[PDB]
Amino acid sequence: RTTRDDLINGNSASCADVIFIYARGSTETGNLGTLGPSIASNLESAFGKDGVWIQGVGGAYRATLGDNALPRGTSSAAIREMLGLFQQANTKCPDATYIAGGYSQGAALAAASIEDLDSAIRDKIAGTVLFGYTKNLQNRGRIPNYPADRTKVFCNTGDLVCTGSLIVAAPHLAYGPDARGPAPEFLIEKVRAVRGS
């Protein structure tokens, strides 16, 4: 449901082929929040339960609303937590293909983490999806040091956070349809592009 720690719980002897690391939005529950579960279910349908590990960013990432105002759109502690998860993935399952995603503050967190990640690990992330990307205008719709072709941003018309503000309006809470269809569609496509099938 809202909490998945497949990577942390997973046995290195039987690594999944795909590992998905996702950061929730501000004030959301568990480590997956409102959008994570929908994406997870669809990934599982495509690769099978044993074929994909779903891992939300918990630990030090409290998803505190106020942290949206910090320089990188989230806290240093949160970035350290997500970086640690990518490092864990690389250590536990070096041959798996990684994919990532984030919503709202989680999107800024995903972007910041990926930007700071060691290139060798970053290059293993086949695709990343960002919903209500708080640094969309500032970063020109990109994740620093990460290819545009592997990035997909979902920014609704009227969602003020995509336009340089921190105001939360109704369109910011309307990403349900995207998480149910195009987002997992994109991730699946990007994984198959490099892994074949």
Swiss-Prot record:
Regulation affecting activity: Inhibited by n-undecyl phosphonate (C11Y4). Inhibited by paraoxon.
SUPFAM superfamilies attached to this UniProt entry: alpha/beta-Hydrolases
Effect of S26A: Severely decreases activity on p-nitrophenyl butyrate
Gene3D superfamilies named among the record's database cross-references: alpha/beta hydrolase
Activity profile over pH: Optimum pH is 8.
Keywords from the UniProt entry: Disulfide bond, Glycoprotein, Hydrolase, Secreted, Serine esterase, Signal, Virulence
Catalytic activity reported: cutin + H2O = cutin monomers
Site (Transition state stabilizer) residue list: S26, Q105
One GO term describing the cellular component: extracellular region
Record note on what altering L65A does: Increases activity on p-nitrophenyl butyrate
Main subcellular location of this protein, as a coarse class: secreted
Effect of V168A: Increases activity on p-nitrophenyl butyrate and poly(ethylene terephthalate) (PET)
UniProt-recorded name of the protein: Cutinase 1
Species of provenance: Fusarium vanettenii
